[PDB]
Design a protein around this ligand. Structure first.
Ligand SMILES: O=C(O)C1CCN(c2ccc(-c3cc(CO)ccc3Cl)cn2)CC1
Ligand SMILES: O=C(O)C1CCN(c2ccc(-c3cc(CO)ccc3Cl)cn2)CC1
Ligand code: NA
Ligand code: NA
Lengths: 323, 323
């Protein structure tokens, strides 16, 4: 059994926060943010949770496929900003769309979450006992960032993107490389949850998003770019066969640098952090959804695309597929 | 390829909190807790995080198998009480045991987490790309419970249990039924994380563990018991072929009742909530580990066992396997 991406969709909260709006609450400016990262604005949720954003993506995916909730076999959701630990974010989406026949769970792998969840979903479809399912990356990073920290608060945004993954007669998944390095975990942190009991030692650590920018920058440009190049090398295709390389949207300068290191022209690495900022697990499927919306990717099996998510854990995952 | 459980292990923090110790911080007693739930004591972490407990399980599994961290292909961890969202709990274990070739992620499915993670892990081994991996359920529910609420605070404990899942040429996974019903999610809640930004509207909500005890009790006795019976019916085995039915360790009276509903004698449903309380995702693998420790389960492929986790989401998962 084989899996294929049949539909793509994205949803961002309507509220737009420009770099200029940020300059009004912190010591930053549009020139500094845009030059260093490529980000011009980002969407910030006013009233919507991570499951709310993911619900909109699910509804959009089913409408495009002409299916109802009951037809789904699973919902796998990648987030580091769930509404709650219990119920999972995926179970909330399941309730919202009436997916009474599906099983639901969240997967935690930060910025590599969508790729890890898509690989996981593919293994369930490969068993031949699951025919259709949703794979959604959704985040409300606005609730995670330290708004008093100008170095990180300007980097992240909110949004959700996802795909409908289905059983196919054609092998679309050509290669995969899922990786982690927890020995470098302290360079990207969020959501510390200390012990709290009349029998536990008093704990107090910073739970807001924290990052060692230089460490992560070098990780992406050296470790991740090498890993992508090795994935292509081990795959049945060559670098020139790739139509697009859809990478985690964290920094535009990083995309230029990774593109050089991989040895592909920058035109093959699309970017949209200019509009959305960095949306962690949602970053690749929002980018993919816009590529389809703009006719860049028809979703007719005519293209070979590489997906590469990288971030917290440290985690990095690369998929090469026919789309 | 096929997957099989080769090693099992468990770890609980040394600190033991008896029902008598609880009677000192709340108006409860040993007699009332034991009669209604079967729980006599539980382990409460003093200084150890969820990843710390899971690290001990990983070290124990590798020692039993006579392997090192570099031999592992993956680490999949089920929890609703992670140390942090980023890095994942599994990435922390990866760092702690030096698992440099493994990928790591956490799976969120509350009390069904270990079963969902074991099913997921089996799909990764089934691909033939992976040979060995860890599947661990780990919780520090002590940090989740409302210690001012005598109705729930006495129910939960801390601990971790897990397995080493390896490639085999012989089939071990005979049947599975993974299910969810988010439409009934409000009866078991924990870890609400509201929006928090200069651009967000936040009303705030109770983040401590909350439960509608009779709704969950009735769900286990009706919905889950029926689902287990249907899993056996659809599987290539019959009820009488089962050596043991290892169920989520929430309540001893529930175990008596679904054993009657399933139509199996109570001797086939082992229990250990007497020592550990309810450890959510860790409950089944701690129970399995003790069954092996006591020679009940030799791990030599001679037995047919059913695993059934059920809880928050709502989620419920059943696996039938040769062990
Ligand atoms: O040049 C500067 O001034 C700075 C230099 C540091 N920068 C960085 C560095 C790393 C990331 C990043 C973040 C994630 C999300 O977890 C994932 C992946 C990446 Cl590569 C984002 N920005 C900002 C501009
Ligand atoms: O008899 C009494 O007074 C009360 C009656 C209510 N009780 C309950 C109710 C539900 C659960 C439970 C919890 C989870 C979450 O892990 C999952 C599955 C179950 Cl079935 C445990 N105890 C406590 C004793
Ligand atoms: Na190649
Ligand atoms: Na049967």
């Amino acid at each position: 059994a084989f899996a294929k991406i049949s539909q793509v969709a994205h949803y961002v909260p309507e509220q737009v926060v420009t770099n200029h709006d940020l300059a009004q609450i912190m010591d930053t400016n549009d020139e500094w943010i845009s030059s260093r990262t490529g980000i011009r604005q980002r969407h910030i949720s006013r009233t919507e949770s991570t499951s709310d954003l993911a619900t909109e993506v699910a509804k959009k995916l089913m409408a495009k496929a002409g299916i109802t909730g009951k037809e789904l076999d699973f919902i796998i959701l990648a987030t580091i900003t769930p509404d709650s630990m219990m119920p999972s974010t995926a179970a909330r989406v399941q309730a919202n769309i009436g997916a009474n026949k599906a099983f639901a769970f969240d997967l935690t792998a930060a910025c590599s979450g969508f790729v890890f969840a898509l690989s996981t979903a593919e293994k369930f479809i490969a068993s031949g006992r699951f025919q259709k399912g949703l794979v959604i990356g959704s985040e409300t990073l606005s609730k995670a960032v330290d708004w008093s920290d100008r170095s990180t608060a300007v980097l992240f945004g909110d949004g959700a993107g996802g795909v409908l993954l289905e059983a196919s007669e054609q092998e679309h998944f050509l290669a995969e490389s899922l990786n982690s390095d927890g020995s470098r975990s302290e360079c990207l942190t969020y959501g510390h949850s200390g012990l709290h009991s009349p029998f536990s030692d008093q704990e107090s650590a910073d739970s807001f998003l924290k990052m060692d920018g230089r460490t992560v920058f070098d990780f992406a440009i050296r470790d991740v770019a090498k890993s992508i190049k090795q994935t292509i090398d081990e795959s049945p295709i060559e670098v020139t066969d790739l139509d697009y390389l859809l990478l985690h949207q964290a920094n535009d300068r990083i995309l230029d640098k990774m593109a050089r290191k991989i040895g592909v022209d920058r035109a093959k690495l699309p970017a949209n952090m200019m509009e959305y900022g960095n949306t962690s697990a949602a970053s690749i499927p929002i980018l993919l959804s816009e590529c389809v919306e703009q006719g860049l990717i028809p979703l007719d099996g005519s293209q070979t695309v590489l997906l590469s998510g990288f971030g917290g854990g440290l985690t990095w995952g690369t998929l090469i597929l026919t789309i």
